[PDB]
Every structure is written in C-alpha cells, then in structure tokens.
Design a binder for this molecule. Structure first.
Ligand SMILES: C=C1C[C@H](C)C[C@@H]2CC=C[C@@H](C/C=C\C(=O)O[C@H]([C@@H](O)/C=C/[C@@H]3CC(C)=CCO3)C[C@@H]3O[C@H]3[C@@H](O)C1)O2
Ligand SMILES: Nc1nc2c(ncn2[C@@H]2O[C@H](COP(=O)(O)OP(=O)(O)OP(=O)(O)O)[C@@H](O)[C@H]2O)c(=O)[nH]1
Ligand SMILES: Nc1ncnc2c1ncn2[C@@H]1O[C@H](COP(=O)(O)OP(=O)(O)CP(=O)(O)O)[C@@H](O)[C@H]1O
Ligand SMILES: Nc1nc2c(ncn2[C@@H]2O[C@H](COP(=O)(O)OP(=O)(O)O)[C@@H](O)[C@H]2O)c(=O)[nH]1
Ligand SMILES: [Ca+2]
Ligand SMILES: [Ca+2]
Ligand SMILES: [Ca+2]
Ligand SMILES: [Mg+2]
Ligand SMILES: [Mg+2]
Ligand SMILES: [Mg+2]
Lengths: 439, 54, 348, 426
C-alpha cells in the first residue's frame, strides 16, 4: 500500500477539498467523528483506503490532507463544520491576509513568508508514510493564492520529493462565477511556472460545470456548493482507483503512463455521465451504451470543446456501478462506427477500461440523483487546446495595453515574466497543433 | 476488437480493448527568485519614502 | 437589437447580407474584435471556432461549418469520397480520381497508372485532367501528366476528363452547372431554386487541348480568352428557365427530370455523409454555411459532381434574392425579428 | 483583510461622515448608544470591519473626526448618533482654515496633523489585520481638502502598504461657498492622483441636479445633497460590510477596478433615487442605475467608455434575473465598454436591503467620461490663474505660483490620459 497526500490551496481548492472528503467518507463508511465501523484492524491497516486515510490508536481515520489558504474565512468553515473532528489542527493552515487575486502577491510576497510552514506540515504527513507515491493538488487558476502560491509549492515539492508524482485538479476561470478581471493573467502565469512540475492535470472549466448544473440539475443559478458537489463526483471517480481494490490506475504514476505520452501535453479531458437531478421522481435508468455515448457529447465535458476536430492520444473509461465488460465492448463497437474518433498515428486506437461495482455515492439531500451506473471518461485530446486559445486571447487583449500590470510589478514581479509565461503558452498551443492537425 | 489484460477482483474488473494497432530549479535558485522580488519591493518602497521625505 | 461582426471583406455574398441586416433596423454592426456578438460573418482562413460560444447570455452563430473543408478541398474531397462507406465505392456520380503527391515540398500514383494502362491497351479514351485547390493540365498521356505536378509543388488530383459532355446548340459548346446550397443550424439542407450554367463561347474540340477556352468553363477564363464571350448569352451565363426550354425543345425532357433529380441526390449524399462530423446540434455555438456545388452533364444526361466550393460567390442577377434567403432562413430563424420560398428542402 | 479605519475631515467631511455612520449603524442594528438590537446574524458577521467591540458588548465606530475649528464637530457630537463616537477620537483646533488649501495643508493643518496621527496609530494598533483607510472630505474648502490630503500623505508614509480610499466631494459653481474652490480642488486632485488607490468622485453639481430635476426639490439644501451621499456610501461599502466573495476587501476591489494606477477616480450611481411603496423590478434597478441621471459625478457616461464596472444589488430578488439584466445591459450597449478588458463588469448581491427599500442597486464605474469633471475644474482654475486672481490668499501662506502651475499640469495630464484609453482599440 502506497500513500497519497492531498493538498488544497486557496478558496476553490479548499471548498472543493471539503466536498471531496465528505464524499470519500460516505463512500468508505467513515463517520464525521472519524470512526469506521467496517474497519476491523483497529489503529492501523494496509487496506486500499489507507492510501487516503491514516489511523490512530483510538480508531480515528484521518485524511492525508493539508488545507492552505492565505486568509482564514474558508478554512475556518472546516474547523467548525460537520467534519471538524476529522482533521487535526496542524493540517489546516491559515494566513492573515490573502493574495487579492494577484499571482505575484501569492507567489512572491506572501508565498515567501508561509512556504516553509506549509512544507513542514506536509513533511509531518510524509513522515507517517511507509511509501508515499506523491501529491494531489487542488486549486483555482484565477485566485491569487490558487495560482501564485500553488506554483511556488509545486516548484518546492519537486525539490523536496523529486521522485514523487504530482497531479493537479485545477479550476479554469469562467466569468459567470468569476471574482476578478485579471484571472487570465493568473492562469497563464501559474500554468507557465507549474508546467514542468505537474505530471498530470485535470482542468475543470467552471463554465462547463455551471451549465451542466443548469441544464441537468435544473438549478437556476448554481452556487459554489452545487458546483463543488458535482466536481467532487468527478474527482472521486478519478481517484476511486487509488482508494479501492482494482488493476487500473492503482498508483499516481499510472495516470501519466496511461494518459500522457508527451510531458507538456498533460491535460486530459474529463467527461462524466449521467448527471440526473434528485428532484425528478420518475427517471429511467440509462444503459451502458447510453452513458458511454454521452461521453462523446460536448455538453457533458468538464471543458467545452470539440474532440471531433482534434486527435486522441489516450482514452480511459472509469465505470462505477452495474456494468460488465460485455456491455462496454458492445457500446464501444457501435459508438466507433458512429462517431469521429481519430487517434494520432503514433498511438493505438483503443480504450483502457475500469469497472468498480459500487455505484456512485451521492450526498444525502444533494442535487444529484442516485443512479445504478455511471462513467467518467478521461481522454487526452488535442481539442482541449481550445481552452488555452481562449485564455491566451484574453491575456493578449489586456497585456497589449499593460492593463493591471502595475499590480504585479508592484509586488516584486518583473514585467518580463508576463512575456515569458505567454511565450511558453504559445509554444504549448503550437505543440497541440503539431500532434493534432494535418493541414 | 481484442480484449486484453483482463483483471478481476470482488470490487470490479479492468481491461483494455484495442480497435487498431499504431502506425528543475534547485532550492537555492528558488530562494534567489523570492529574494530578488523582495529586493525590488524594498527598492520601490524606499523610492516612495524618499519622495515623501522630499 | 441583435448585433453582429464582419471579418471577411471580400465576400460579395455577405457584404450584401450585412447591408440587408442593417436595413432591418434590428441589427447593429460592431467592430471586428468585439466578442459581444450574436452573429459572426467569419474569415475564410483560420476562423477562431474555439472562441465561439463562451459569451454568457449570448446565443452565437457563425456562417461557416467547422470541418466543411473536407468537402471543399479538391484533394480532401477525393479522399472523403473513397474512404466513406456512405459514398466510396458504389458512387457513380464522381469521376475516377486519384491524389498525386509531388516529389518536393497516404500517397497515390501507380494505382492510378494501373487504371491508365487498362484503357491504353483497351481502345478507350485515356484523356485525364490534373488540378489542385490557372494551373490545370488536360492531357491524354500519363507521362506528361506527372511531369507537371512536380513542377508546381502542390498536392494535386488527377481525374478522368469527361470526353463526352452535353454540348449546347448552336455553338457546340461545353458548360458547367453551379448550384447554391444553404445548410442552416438545424442541418436542414436548402437548394436555391435558381442555378446558373457557366457556358463556353468556343466550339468544343477533341484534338486541341492546348486551347483551354472551350475546355475550361470558368467565367473568369471565358472573358479573358474568348472573342465571342457574351455572344450566346450575357456573361456566358444561362439560367434555369432558358436551359429548361432548351431541354424541352431539343431533347423532349425537363431540367428537373434529366438533371435536377441527380443534383439533389448528390447534394444530399455529400452533406449527410459529413453531417456527424460537423453538425452543431448539441454544440455551444451554432453554424450555417452557403456552398457552391459545380456539376458536369454528359451526353447521356448523366450528372457528375466536379467540386464543392465552401466560399462561393453568386451571379449578379441573383445576389439580391439569395441573400434575403440567407437572412430569412439562416439568420432570422435563430434571431427572429419583431412565401413562396426561394429554396427547396432536401429532406435529410 | 479585516478592519478599516475611517477619517472624516472639515465641515463637509464631518457632515457626510456623521450621516454615513448614522445610516450603516441602522443597517447593522446598532443604536445611538452603541448597543446592538438587530434580528439577524448577517448584520454582525463583518461588523468588526467598521466597529470595535467595547465593554458590555457594545460597538464603537473605528472613526476619527477632524477639523480646524470646533463648530461642525460640536454639531456632530450633539447630533442623533453623536454619543456613539469615541470621545478621544475628536481632534480639532480653533483657528479654522478659511477655505484655504494652503492653510489646511501647510500652516494651520501642519500644527494639528501629529495629534490626528496619534489617534490613527491607536486605532491601527488595535487592529487584528488592518486593510486600510477611508477618508470623507470635500476638495473645495481648506481643512478637508488641504489638511485631508496632508493626512493622506502622512498616512502613506507610515502605512505604505495599506489601501487608501476616499469619498471626495467635488465643488460646483451651482453649489459654491467661495470663488477659490477650483484652486483648492485642483491642488487636492494632484495629491489624490498620487496617494489614493480608490477615490469616489461625488460631484455637488450632480447631487444638486438630481435633487432639483429628479427629486423635484425647488431649493435643495446641504441636507438633501447629503441624503444622496449617505445612500451612495452605504451602497458602495456594502460588499465590505456583509458576507460575499466579490470586491469584499479594499485591495481586491482595487485590483478589479484600477487597470492603471493614476486612473482610480470612480463615478458612483444608485437606484432608486429617494429623498415609495412599490419596489423596483430587477430590470428597473438596472435601467436606472446606469442612467446618466442616476450618476453622482456630473459626467455623461455616453461621452466615454467604461474601463471597469462594479455593481451591487441589495434585497431579496432572483440572482438569475440580476445576471440576466446585467448581461443585457452590456450586450445592448457593448460600445461603451472597452473591449480590451474582457468581462470588465462584475456584480454582487446582498440579501439585506437599505432602510425604507425592498430593493436597490449601486453602481461604481471607472469611466473615461470622468475626464469631463476634471476638465470643468481645470477650466475654472485657469480662468482665475491666468490673471493670478485671489492668489494672494495662498502666497500669504508661503506657497508660490509654481506649485499651482504643477498641480494644473498634472491634472491636465490626467485628462489626456483618460482621452488616450477612450480612443484605444483592440
Ligand atoms: C430602456 C432604455 C434603453 C434600452 C431599451 C435598455 C437597454 C438595456 C438595459 C438598460 C439600458 C441602459 C440603462 C440606462 C440608459 O440607457 O439610460 C439612458 C441614458 O442614460 C444612457 C446611459 C448609457 C447606458 C450605458 C450602458 C452606457 C453608457 O450610458 C436614458 C434612457 O431613458 C433610459 C431608457 O431609454 C433606457 O439599455
Ligand atoms: N468551482 C469552484 N470555483 C471556485 C470556488 N471558489 C472560488 N472559485 C473560483 O476560483 C477563482 C477565484 O480564486 P479563489 O480560489 O477564490 O482565490 P484564492 O485562491 O483563495 O486566492 P486569493 O483569494 O486571491 O488569495 C474564480 O474563478 C472563482 O470562480 C469554489 O468553491 N468552487
Ligand atoms: N473531370 C472533368 N471532366 C470534364 N471537365 C472537367 C473535369 N474536371 C474539371 N473540368 C472542367 O474544367 C474546369 C475546372 O474547374 P474546377 O471546378 O475543377 O476548379 P475551379 O478552380 O474552376 C473552382 P470552381 O469549382 O468554383 O469552378 C471544370 O470547371 C470544368 O470546366
Ligand atoms: N455635499 C456637501 N457638500 C458640502 C457640505 N458642506 C460643504 N460642502 C462643499 O464643500 C466645499 C467647502 O468645503 P468645506 O468642507 O465646507 O470646508 P472645510 O471645513 O475647510 O473642509 C464647497 O464646495 C461646498 O459646496 C455638505 O454638507 N455636503
Ligand atoms: Ca485498518
Ligand atoms: Ca497656532
Ligand atoms: Ca507625539
Ligand atoms: Mg481567498
Ligand atoms: Mg474552386
Ligand atoms: Mg464650509
């Protein structure tokens, strides 16, 4: 058994982290007070769940997680919330004043003052690990902490643990729920600096999740709670293989080897189905064929973009619930002769498939209906570069006038880092065009 | 379609179906970056305090 | 008030579409880079499809289908037709074609040569034509065909030349048929009821392929190289009413029976083939597009598809009617303003 | 990221300031004696931003009151909520400033500034985490204008990394006390351009016009003008005072609102204008708040473009309708929003409405049309300065003409800078 440490940085990373651990506890039968009746080996074990939960002599099951935010508002919700008893105070780290949506403020100014305290709390967790495999880092692109502090944290993690894998769950910015006009700057700055330090990153566009919540959950104006409960379902299906018995994606290294043939091109598209509202009493259960077909619908993707006009490098299907290999191969047969699924020449056309018999757990009283089967597809498609193009365009519009640049320079950042980050993204866009476009 | 690497346990199954064959900065360098930014912050503030002093 | 932007200055079709929208009193034109638009009239090259449909509170629409280039690129059209089970073999309306690659800056040839040899020692006409997306060679010898593709340095297609075209009388003159097709956001396929024949002003020859004025029916070429241009009809352009009369008088049939039935069938086959790949039915933005289909008619009254144009111009006489049609069918359908249709619906 | 320290200086500054505190005290359920008597926890969650906790669990405004004579402050102290202010926080002289910037900034003011700074320091040092300061004052007199800007300079020197925020009342010949107002205003704008992060431009000409040809007041008094200012201030500080995730602290607001450091002068607006019975619909709030008639700076937004806009909707209403209407206002007037700052309009919603209203909306715009205001002042300044009229009042206090020339040059540069970005295109 190899342990995984989750790190939650800034408001988005913390609130999402809080939704995931809630869900993890429901899935493993852990109660708010930390106890697990199902667990028999008291005070320790080598079970699959132990990858995410350590144990105390008193039989408390404790998340291998640290929460970091530059202001205490959000993390204090955790300390006093439903799962207060789950975490230890050492895990929750708060600062005095936040990064004010300024990458440079979070990275340079405030980052410098708190980074050693953070790395040390992480070390305490690493020290209880017999065989740590690496880190899962949750954060927004757009916030000053989420963007600036995370990239410093990632740089230092590569130093203190150079062998370990690092995976990201990043919230890509959408104006519909956005809190700052400079988010594009923060996104490109953080992506540039983080790039070489992340083995695999799952981007979730708030726009996609927002719209899914509106059209499928009939939520008129989604809140962060609605968004986060949906995000945590997707996150759980992605991490479920590290927490449960199985043979696909059982260690963090597997994500890279299965999904990322070229190191920079490490942003797989997540697609999820089915999302059904818990308010619809009569609903007909979707089949393996149908939920699988839904994986090739832009309306269900974590980022809106069109894979028909890109090429695939890898594809993974993660099913939870009443699914057998026969139904999957049948679904894939029909779908293939019906849809535009072009793989790059230097990769095999195929799917790695995982099935977990426990159907998705939903939060009691949440917006999500319980369903008997669900799937999350992780596909590495060049079509996701559409999200980089949008982002880079917005950056260009503002940067051409040097709008808001002084806020960054004023925090000790050099202006050239803007052009440096933007050059890196331009190369990135070019790399995607090379692997995915003919002429 | 060929199904391979089929693995079964009580929790579930995994396998692979093929449809067609194919055809870092040191600790020192980072602290230097943080320190150089802090120095620029110190310099900008000293200029402000100089201006105010005049 | 609906808003829109303009990003192709050379489009005569949309230059008129814009002026129509302004005239409505319910459409306002914006600056090129203002993303706050309902309607984009895009550029022909490298249109930023990835930037469409991410503007909260705006339904957005563009006048191009992403992916339609597969149909509108000569090399691509041949590949699409050979490899698509829907078309491919058992397509009898596209001339035998091959994609040939120059030896300078997969690949065909040889396979082409094998078919060529068949008619060589087969007592059959082996006149072929080389072309790509001025710059066309009509020859009956394979040797001087390839020995022309490499001199140009661009992907080319060599297809069978139609040696037995239907010739208009008097004049013994070739021609081609242009049809305009509008595909709306719902993927309804609309054939404009008015077509045009682009005629040659020179009698058709069979031994002089050097004189490419009675062999190439391009209106651009005809004015430049023909003494009699405009002699038989204005601008070397015959419209459907006249052509129909001709067919009745000369051949005892109608345009609809002898030709249009086939034209409709071909348009449907091509567009339904590519539909799954380009449909914007469940996309975050929607598109429509106007296509230019060009056909040849042989002497047996068999219709052959020659090429599909993705950014077609129109015929002066017709600009007005068609453009209003685009507005009514393609644009006002999505953004309704506060018949006797000019289109025929090819029912997908 | 928490406590704000409020300073109010001079007659205008103290009169609007008293009203401000009167209004927010009511909204937060705090009585003239500083005792909380509300019926919600939303009104205490961020109460510490503007109030200190005292003995007996009562609330004291983190407010410092300043003047060079004692009159207006005596009136404040004997006012309705006069008892709520910390007695040690009244700092005043006896000489007055005679509507003279030089007196407030260089002579009479210099004498008193250190005692004000002592009070500022005592309030700061009590702060868990001071975010910054907000100053209320006019630019047309002597104390608020001259001493006010002197204080800002000294505060920056001592707290150079805190946000400095002002509500600055601009003078109007329509509502004038003396002919030297343009001199005092121009000298102050020079200071404000360099030393504040956010300045809310409250134009007495706008407040007058609104009272006259919207509220139908034949003869507006300073009281009527201040009713509008009270409401605007309560409105613009809402996101600071109640739970929310958008522009919830001074620095975050500044990062979202200010794309270039000198261009930090905001045009406020609100709806509905009151001096009732039927609540406004969300679409009405939106139409009205963006109407030039609802603006507190006398500049026509149609004469320029918005760099950035912040809006705040108050009351119980549909967040969906709010988003829709706000999107509608931008989509149907996209010409007036610069296209090179994408998504430059942000919106917050707070459940708690203001006194006497079911629904309201407050607008804060960074528009290049604000150049009209500075141009108006510049013109009045030059009309007198070309003939050195009334200059002796200033040279008598040791100032020389060169300082006027420099303040005038700097304000005209400010105008030309706005024109640049008004003309700028993607
Ligand atoms: C109803 C409208 C015009 C259209 C129908 C509404 C459209 C959508 C939503 C709101 C309004 C804008 C709000 C007020 C308004 O237009 O007031 C006008 C005048 O003051 C123009 C102000 C403009 C508004 C904007 C957005 C930028 C520049 O200033 C003054 C006009 O009396 C107001 C009324 O006519 C406004 O624009
Ligand atoms: N999906 C989701 N997005 C969030 C959440 N909280 C914030 N965001 C998004 O994150 C971006 C803002 O960054 P934050 O995480 O709030 O900021 P931060 O990391 O705490 O950094 P600072 O506050 O500037 O110090 C915006 O795009 C928000 O829409 C959340 O709970 N869920
Ligand atoms: N296979 C064939 N058999 C007989 N004639 C052919 C032919 N292929 C092409 N042509 C004839 O000559 C000209 C080539 O025109 P083609 O349509 O292929 O390219 P083009 O560059 O003219 C664009 P457009 O389709 O808009 O005319 C044909 O239009 C028609 O005149
Ligand atoms: N809105 C408003 N403006 C005022 C008030 N009192 C004075 N003014 C304006 O402020 C300027 C005079 O400055 P004032 O504050 O009286 O002088 P100070 O005491 O030296 O700061 C003039 O432009 C007046 O129109 C007031 O109560 N409300
Ligand atoms: Ca155990
Ligand atoms: Ca004295
Ligand atoms: Ca002292
Ligand atoms: Mg935060
Ligand atoms: Mg062509
Ligand atoms: Mg006075």
């Amino acid at each position: 058994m190899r342990e995984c440490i989750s790190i939650h940085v800034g408001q988005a990373g913390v609130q999402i982290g809080n939704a995931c651990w809630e869900l993890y506890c429901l899935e493993h039968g852990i109660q708010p007070d930390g106890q697990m009746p199902s667990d028999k080996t008291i005070g320790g074990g080598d079970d699959s769940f132990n990858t995410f939960f350590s144990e105390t002599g008193a039989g408390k099951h404790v998340p291998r997680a640290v929460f970091v935010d530059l202001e205490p508002t959000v993390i204090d919700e955790v300390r006093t919330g439903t799962y207060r008893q789950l975490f230890h105070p050492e895990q929750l780290i708060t600062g005095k004043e936040d990064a004010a949506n300024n990458y440079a403020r979070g990275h340079y100014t405030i980052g410098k003052e708190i980074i050693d305290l953070v790395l040390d709390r992480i070390r305490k967790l690493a020290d209880q690990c017999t065989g740590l495999q690496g880190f899962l880092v949750f954060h927004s692109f757009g916030g000053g902490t989420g963007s600036g502090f995370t990239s410093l944290l990632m740089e230092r993690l590569s130093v203190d643990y150079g062998k370990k894998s690092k995976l990201e769950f990043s919230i890509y910015p959408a104006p519909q729920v956005s809190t700052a006009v400079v988010e594009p700057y923060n996104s490109i700055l953080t992506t540039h600096t983080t790039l070489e330090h992340s083995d695999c990153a799952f981007m979730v566009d708030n726009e996609a999740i927002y719209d899914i919540c509106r059209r499928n959950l009939d939520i008129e104006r989604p809140t962060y709670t609605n968004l986060n409960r949906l995000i945590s379902q997707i996150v759980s299906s992605i991490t479920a293989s590290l927490r449960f018995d199985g043979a696909l994606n059982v260690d963090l290294t597997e994500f890279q080897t299965n999904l990322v043939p070229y190191p920079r091109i490490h942003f797989p598209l997540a697609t999820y189905a089915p999302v059904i509202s818990a308010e619809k009493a009569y609903h007909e259960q979707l089949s393996v064929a149908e939920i699988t077909n839904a994986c090739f619908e832009p309306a269900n993707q974590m980022v809106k973009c069109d894979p028909r006009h890109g090429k695939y490098m890898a594809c993974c299907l993660l099913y939870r619930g009443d699914v057998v290999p026969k139904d999957v191969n049948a679904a894939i047969a029909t779908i293939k002769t019906k849809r535009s699924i072009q793989f790059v020449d230097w990769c095999p056309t195929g799917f790695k498939v995982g099935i977990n018999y426990q159907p998705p757990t939903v939060v009691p009283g949440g917006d999500l209906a319980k369903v008997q089967r669900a799937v999350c597809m992780l596909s590495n498609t060049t079509a996701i570069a559409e999200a980089w193009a949008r982002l880079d365009h917005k950056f260009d519009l503002m940067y051409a006038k040097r709008a808001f640049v002084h806020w960054y320079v004023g925090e000790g950042m050099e202006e050239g880092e803007f052009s440096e980050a933007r050059e890196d993204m331009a190369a990135l866009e070019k790399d995607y065009e090379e692997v995915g476009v003919d002429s | 379609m060929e199904v391979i690497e089929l693995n079964k346990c009580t929790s579930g199954q995994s396998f692979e179906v093929i449809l067609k064959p194919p055809s870092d900065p040191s600790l020192e360098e980072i602290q230097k970056k943080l320190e150089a930014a802090e120095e620029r912050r110190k310099y900008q503030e000293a200029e402000l305090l100089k201006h105010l002093a005049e | 008030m609906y808003t829109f932007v303009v990003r192709d200055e050379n489009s005569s079709v949309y230059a008129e579409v814009s002026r129509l929208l302004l005239a409505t009193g319910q459409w306002k034109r914006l600056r090129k880079d203002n993303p706050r638009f309902n309607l984009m009239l895009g550029e022909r090259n490298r249109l930023p499809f990835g930037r469409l449909g991410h503007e909260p509170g705006l339904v957005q629409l563009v006048n191009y289908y992403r992916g339609a280039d597969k149909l509108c690129r000569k090399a691509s059209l041949v590949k699409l037709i050979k490899t698509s089970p829907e078309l491919s073999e058992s397509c009898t309306w596209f001339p035998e074609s091959y994609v040939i690659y120059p030896t300078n800056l997969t690949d065909e040839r040889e396979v082409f040569l094998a078919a060529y040899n068949r008619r060589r020692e087969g007592r059959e006409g082996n006149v072929w034509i080389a072309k790509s997306s001025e710059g066309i060679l009509i020859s009956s010898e394979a040797s001087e065909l390839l020995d022309f593709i490499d001199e140009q340095g661009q992907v080319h297609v060599i297809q069978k030349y139609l040696e037995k075209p239907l010739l208009l009388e008097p004049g013994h003159r070739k021609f081609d048929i242009r049809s305009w097709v509008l595909v709306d956001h719902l993927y309804n396929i609309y054939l404009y009821r008015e077509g045009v024949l682009r005629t040659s002003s020179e009698p058709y020859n069979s031994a002089n392929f050097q004189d490419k004025t009675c062999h190439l029916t391009n209106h651009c070429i005809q004015k430049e190289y023909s003494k009699n241009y405009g002699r038989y009809e204005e601008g070397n352009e015959m419209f459907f009413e006249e052509f129909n009369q001709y067919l009745m008088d000369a051949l005892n049939t109608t345009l609809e029976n002898s030709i249009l039935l086939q034209i409709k069938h071909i348009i449907r086959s091509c567009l339904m083939c590519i539909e799954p790949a380009i449909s914007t039915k469940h996309l975050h933005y929607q598109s429509f597009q106007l296509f230019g289909f060009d056909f040849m008619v042989d002497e047996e009254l068999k219709v052959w598809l020659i090429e599909v144009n993705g950014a077609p111009a129109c015929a002066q006489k017709l600009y007005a009617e068609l453009c209003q049609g685009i507005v009514d069918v393609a644009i006002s359908s999505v953004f309704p303003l506060a018949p006797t249709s000019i289109f025929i619906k090819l029912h997908h | 990221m928490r406590e704000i320290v409020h300073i109010q200086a001079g007659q205008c500054g103290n009169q609007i300031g008293a009203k401000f505190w009167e209004v927010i005290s009511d909204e937060h359920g705090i009585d003239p004696t500083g005792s909380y008597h509300g019926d919600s926890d939303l009104q205490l969650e961020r109460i510490n931003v503007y109030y200190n906790e005292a003995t007996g669990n009562k609330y004291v405004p983190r407010a410092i009151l300043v003047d060079l004579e004692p009159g207006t402050m005596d009136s404040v102290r004997s006012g309705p909520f006069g008892q709520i202010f910390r007695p040690d926080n009244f700092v005043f002289g006896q000489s007055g400033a005679g509507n003279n910037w030089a007196k407030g900034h260089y002579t009479e003011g210099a004498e008193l500034v250190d005692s004000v700074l002592d009070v500022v320091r005592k309030e700061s040092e009590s702060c868990d985490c001071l975010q910054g300061f907000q100053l209320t004052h006019s630019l047309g007199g002597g104390t608020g204008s001259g001493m006010g800007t002197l204080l800002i300079s000294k505060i920056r020197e001592e707290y150079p990394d805190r946000i400095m925020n002002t509500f600055s009342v601009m003078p109007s010949p329509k509502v004038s006390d003396t002919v030297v107002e343009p001199y005092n205003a121009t000298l102050s704008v020079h200071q404000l351009v360099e030393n504040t992060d956010e300045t809310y431009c409250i134009d007495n000409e706008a407040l007058y016009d609104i009272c006259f040809r919207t509220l139908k007041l034949t003869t507006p008094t300073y009281g009527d003008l201040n009713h509008l200012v009270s409401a605007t201030m309560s409105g613009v500080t809402t996101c600071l005072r109640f739970p929310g995730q958008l522009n919830a602290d001074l620095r975050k607001l500044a990062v979202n609102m200010v794309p270039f450091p000198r261009l930090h002068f905001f045009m406020p607006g609100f709806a509905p204008l009151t001096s009732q019975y039927r609540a406004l619909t969300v679409p009405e709030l939106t139409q009205q708040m963006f109407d030039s008639k609802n603006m507190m700076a006398a500049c026509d937004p149609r004469h320029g473009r918005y760099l950035t806009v912040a809006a705040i909707f108050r009351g119980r209403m549909s967040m969906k309708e709010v988003d829709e209407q706000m999107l509608n206002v931008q989509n149907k007037n996209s010409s007036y929003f610069v296209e090179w700052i994408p998504n430059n309009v942000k919106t917050a919603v707070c459940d708690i409405p203001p006194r006497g209203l079911k629904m309201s909306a407050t607008f804060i715009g960074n528009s290049t049309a604000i150049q009209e205001l500075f141009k108006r002042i510049s013109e009045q300044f030059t009309a007198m300065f070309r003939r050195k009229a009334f200059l002796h009042w200033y040279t008598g206090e040791g100032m020389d003409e060169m300082e006027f020339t420099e303040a005038e040059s700097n304000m005209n540069d400010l105008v030309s800078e706005y024109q640049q970005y008004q003309d700028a295109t993607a």
